[PDB]
Paper text:
One such Rab15 effector is Rep15, which is known to have a role in receptor recycling from the endocytic recycling compartment but otherwise remains poorly characterized. Biochemical validation of the interactions is presented and crystal structures of the Rep15:Rab3B and Rep15:Rab3C complexes provide additional mechanistic insight. We find that Rep15 adopts a globular structure that is distinct from other reported Rab15, Rab3 and Rab34 effectors. Detailed biochemical studies reveal that Rep15 is selective for Rab15, Rab3 paralogs and Rab34 and does not bind to other evolutionarily similar Rab GTPases.
To do this, we either mixed purified Rep15 and Rabs at 1:1 ratio or co-expressed and purified Rep15 ΔN1:Rab3AQ81L_19-217, Rep15 ΔN1:Rab3BQ81L_18-190 and Rep15 ΔN1:Rab34Q111L_1-237 complexes. All obtained complexes were used to perform the crystallization screen and finally, we obtained crystals for Rep15:Rab3CGppNHp_Q222H_10-227 (bovine), Rep15:Rab3BGppNHp and Rep15_ΔN1:Rab3BQ81L_18-190 complexes. Subsequently, we also obtained Rep15:Rab3BGppNHp and Rep15 ΔN1:Rab3BQ81L_18-190 complex crystals, which diffracted to a resolution 2.75 Å and 2.8 Å, respectively and crystallized in space group C2 and P21 respectively. We solved the Rep15:Rab3B complex structure using Rep15:Rab3C (bovine) as a MR model and Rep15 ΔN1:Rab3BQ81L_18-190 complex structure using Rep15:Rab3BGppNHp complex structure as a MR model. The asymmetric unit contained two copies of the complex. Both copies share nearly the same overall architecture, as indicated by an RMSD of 0.124 Å for Rep15:Rab3BGppNHp complex and and an RMSD of 0.109 Å for the both copies of Rep15 ΔN1:Rab3BQ81L_18-190 complex. Structurally-based sequence alignment of Rab3A and Rab3C shows that apart from the switch I, interswitch and switch II residues, three RabCDRs of Rab3A are involved in making contacts with the Rabphilin-3A, whereas in the case of the Rep15:Rab3 complex structures, RabCDRs are not part of the binding interface.
Residue numbers in the entry:
A (entry chain A): 18 to 118, 129 to 137, 139 to 236
B (entry chain B): 18 to 187
The structure:
């Protein structure tokens, strides 16, 4: 399954390119780059890596619009197509900045007061079994240039012990956890045996 | 602000022209590239009907069965539906009855429905005659339009008819 190895290399490449911009603050201000800017930089490097390797035929990167990002609790979606022309996997990726601590609402006027965590969980429930939520943390408290990953199911499992809200649960999970699984070790279950993911256990996903 | 707000949804098989329909109505533009909708999206358009300001929250649903669950959750609170088939594609017209019962199952909030056969600029590739669409719409109790998002035919008329139907039921 070539797509797994090439996409893992793409993820590590994009994160390493993004590390340059992490830990930057404007000269007088405490302001960092916008979350959308970081997400777009990461996505552009990732997609340019998937091109020149010829794997875009089996992988589609869809950046959520502002409306889609607000509704789905996802910042983009990776759809993995199989040997046939059928969808085999979907990763709903939400990014976080934990170097500094709110979701801005759209012009909806009909209701929607949930967290990004609950929205992502509901999105992945609605899509189906082969859709998994994935948090990517750009920078942690200390080590502002550290990029990590956490599967949503791991946080959900930790929530049966912590009994605290999902965002604080992801925050507690990115700390408190030293065991790591490499990104290529993950995603080896791309087009088969979706039980390997969602059963990754108490572990974070390391990029570099 | 505004005087009314109506939730409209656009449903139908994939590659039928739901996004193209929405983009033509909202931005008066068209692009031939096929970017399939992931789950759902929406756009807001303000119109003036019956000397009243009506805002339209128009949701573009995905046509693939894979999203049929998530899309259905957003039928909640919908007041109007654009059920679209493609006159080029017979499978899309055969799927209409299933879409209509899906409307009935998941909203049925006295939601008005409009049946639309898109791509009517593609007369050389038509496989569903106009009479078939008229008959099915008359049976189901829907108003009917053949339209083209490419050439901007009967797009505004379809949306305005939906808005008129919603306004009258009050
Ligand atoms: N000739 C012609 N082509 C059209 C028309 N409307 C859409 N198309 C083309 O048909 C294809 C379907 O476009 P979409 O609007 O994205 O189809 P869709 O209903 O949104 O499909 P999903 O997003 O998967 O649900 C695109 O390649 C368009 O360029 C039309 O009125 N006439
Ligand atoms: Mg679409």
């Amino acid at each position: 399954p070539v797509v797994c190895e090439v996409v893992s290399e793409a993820i590590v490449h994009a994160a390493q390119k993004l590390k340059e911009y992490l830990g930057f603050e404007y000269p007088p201000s405490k302001l960092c780059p916008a979350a959308n800017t970081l997400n777009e930089i990461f996505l552009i490097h990732f997609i340019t890596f998937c091109q020149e390797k010829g794997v875009d035929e089996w992988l589609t990167t869809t950046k959520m619009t502002k409306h889609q990002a607000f509704l789905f609790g996802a910042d983009w979606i990776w759809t993995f197509w199989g040997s046939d022309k059928q969808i085999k996997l979907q990763l709903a990726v939400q990014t976080l900045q934990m170097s500094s601590p709110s979701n801005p609402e759209s012009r909806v006027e009909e209701s929607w007061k949930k967290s990004r965590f609950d929205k992502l969980e509901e999105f992945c429930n609605l899509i189906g079994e082969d859709c998994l939520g994935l948090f990517i943390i750009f920078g942690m408290p200390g080590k502002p240039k550290d990029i990590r990953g956490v599967v949503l199911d791991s946080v959900k499992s930790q929530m049966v012990r912590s009994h605290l809200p999902g965002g604080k649960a992801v925050a507690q999970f990115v700390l408190e956890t030293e065991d790591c699984v490499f990104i290529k070790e993950l995603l080896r279950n791309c087009l088969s045996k979706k039980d390997g993911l969602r059963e990754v256990g108490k572990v974070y996903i390391s990029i570099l | 602000n505004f005087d009314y707000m109506f939730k409209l949804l656009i449903i139908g098989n994939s590659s039928v022209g739901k996004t193209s329909f929405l983009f033509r109505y909202a931005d008066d533009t068209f692009t031939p590239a096929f970017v399939s909708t992931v789950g759902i999206d929406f756009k807001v358009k303000t119109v003036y009907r019956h000397e009243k300001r009506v805002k339209l929250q128009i949701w573009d649903t995905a046509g693939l069965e894979r999203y049929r669950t998530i899309t259905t959750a957003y039928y909640r609170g919908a007041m109007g539906f654009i059920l679209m088939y493609d006159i080029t594609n017979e499978e899309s017209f055969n799927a209409v009855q299933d879409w209509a019962t899906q409307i009935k199952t998941y909203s049925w909030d006295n939601a008005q429905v409009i049946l639309v056969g898109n791509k009517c600029d593609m007369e050389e590739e038509r496989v569903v005659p106009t009479e078939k669409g008229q008959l099915l719409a008359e049976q189901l109790g829907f108003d009917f339009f053949e339209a083209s998002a490419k050439e901007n035919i009967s797009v505004r008329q379809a949306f305005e008819r939906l808005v008129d139907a919603i306004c009258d039921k009050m």
